[PDB]
């Protein structure tokens, strides 16, 4: 009955508690299979950790784990690409509730498959089967698309920015809880039992969506699935329609959103893997503080977003948000000490106030009956951003490690010079 915000909380808790556990099991099984009994992290760096000599077997197991994560993520992304673009456009024609019930069920099934693989110490290729099965029903991306569309169907033009911000603040709060609860359950007496919370969270999400969610499509027509008009419903969303030159703005905004979330996704990973480097050498608690402060920008940019709107338009708010990201990443990439790193986290407090604005403006452009299609395409873009961010940034960091550590953050900050320019050029051009 109440609303859709709890669904995203419960669904993001699943990802946050799932990805580290899944890769930890990958480490365990792949290492033990190759006769390697050592730490299940990557190679360390500095602070008297060894001699610097390469660990040929540890590097082999690390590469195998990365390759398997790549395989399962890529397979999941393709099945999700072919599924969400068919389940979104349909959602805006039958109701948001079924298209939110289905992916939660898929995630519960995926968590159950993962549990069954861990308890039986099964092969690691079988983890691909669970991800593929969940992808068919629409992955976590379809949950995101359904939630965002459901919000965009219950808010004016002059409110979608704030409503989307509220939803993404719930997303960030779920992420922070997942990360800081994993940092104490996964680490302490964990890696198997904490995965029960993933199944519990997904079961709760499905139950809340089915029996406690109130649909937002005020008129749900009757439409058949496997129609081909849900794939045509994004081609005749981006290419032919909207003829009053509102077609360029869609592409430019989509590109800006792509770049923005790519950088966000890459920099989170490099945060966690770079905090414990050579000149910083952070303890176990300081890393938890860093993760909490990284995920606290979600709910602290919301306060500014609502506060900034009273004086500046909905674009310049995102311009200042991008400036805050740029400043934070620049001062993090030069953070050769822990006061500097924490200041770097602190400056990024209006950091994730830009993404909400972008998707809200994307929604304000499409008709009232096409938010399903729009957010299906945006969810596909976000999945591709996940993949590319992981690949590019995890390949960049080791290369610029003995040359200038922190160039990943510097280059991420150079990337956001493009979204800021794009959004500013669009906003300047409307007014003239």
């Amino acid at each position: 009955a109440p609303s859709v915000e709890p669904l995203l909380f419960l669904a993001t808790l699943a990802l946050g508690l799932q990805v580290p556990l899944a890769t930890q099991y990958l480490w365990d099984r792949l290492g033990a299979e190759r006769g390697y009994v050592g730490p299940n992290a990557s190679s360390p760096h500095g602070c008297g950790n060894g001699s610097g000599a390469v660990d040929p077997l540890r590097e082999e197991v690390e590469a195998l784990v990365a390759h398997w994560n790549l395989c399962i993520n890529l397979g999941g992304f393709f099945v999700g690409l072919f599924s969400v673009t068919l389940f979104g456009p349909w959602s805006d024609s039958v109701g948001r509730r079924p298209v939110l019930v289905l992916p939660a069920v898929g995630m519960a099934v995926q968590a159950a498959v993962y549990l069954l693989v861990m308890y039986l110490r099964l092969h690691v290729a079988y983890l691909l089967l669970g991800r593929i099965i969940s992808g068919l029903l629409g992955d976590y991306n379809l949950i995101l698309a359904g939630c965002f569309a459901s919000v965009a169907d219950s808010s004016n033009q002059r409110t979608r920015t704030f409503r989307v911000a509220i939803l993404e603040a719930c997303l960030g709060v779920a992420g922070m809880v997942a990360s800081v609860g994993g940092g104490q359950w996964r680490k302490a007496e964990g890696y198997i039992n904490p995965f029960w919370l993933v199944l519990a969270a997904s079961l709760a999400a499905a139950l809340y969506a089915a029996l406690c969610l109130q649909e937002t499509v005020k008129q749900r027509r009757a439409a058949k699935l496997l129609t081909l008009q849900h794939y045509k419903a994004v081609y005749k969303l981006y290419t032919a329609p909207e003829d009053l030159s509102s077609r360029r703005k869609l592409a430019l905004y989509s590109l800006a959103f792509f770049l923005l979330v790519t950088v966000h996704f890459g920099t989170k990973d490099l945060y966690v893997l770079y905090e414990l480097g050579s000149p910083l050498c952070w303890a176990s608690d300081l890393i938890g503080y860093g993760s909490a402060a990284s995920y606290l920008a979600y709910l602290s940019s919301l306060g500014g977003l609502r506060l900034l709107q009273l004086c500046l338009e909905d674009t310049w708010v995102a311009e200042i948000g991008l400036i805050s990201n740029i400043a934070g990443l620049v001062v993090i990439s030069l953070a050769t000490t822990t006061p500097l790193m924490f200041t770097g986290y602190g400056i990024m407090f209006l950091s994730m106030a830009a993404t909400p604005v972008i998707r809200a403006k994307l929604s304000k452009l499409v008709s009232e009956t096409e938010q399903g299609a729009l957010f299906a395409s945006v969810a596909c873009v976000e999945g591709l951003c996940s993949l590319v961010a992981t690949g590019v940034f995890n390949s960049l960091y080791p290369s610029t490690l003995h040359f200038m550590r922190g160039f990943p953050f510097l280059f991420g900050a150079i990337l956001l010079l493009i979204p800021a320019a794009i959004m500013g050029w669009i906003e300047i051009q409307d007014s003239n």
Partner: nanobody
Amino acid sequence: VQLVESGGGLVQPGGSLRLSCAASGFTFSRYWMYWVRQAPGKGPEWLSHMNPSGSDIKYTDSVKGRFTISRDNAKNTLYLQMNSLKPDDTAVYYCVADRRALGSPEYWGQGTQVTVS
């Protein structure tokens, strides 16, 4: 945080060297404990490891049935006795300490010299 080891030395082939890892600076009841060596002119050769309790003991087949890890948490020392030592064993044995998690640091010990001959 510091881990200090003292069991090395010049022992004959077939001796019974007994390393201790007198750890402190942290809890040690919540930390996985490893062992590793850097043979002369070569790379790390991870030997064994043991979960915070003493139930998940794993070895490597080069040292299976010949190295016997142990820990005593009321004293905070990690052992690894070495029966039937061989000239291929001489190395600098380190004593790692991880939480068995990705976002956790590992604390390499100083490591002592075993000079089997």
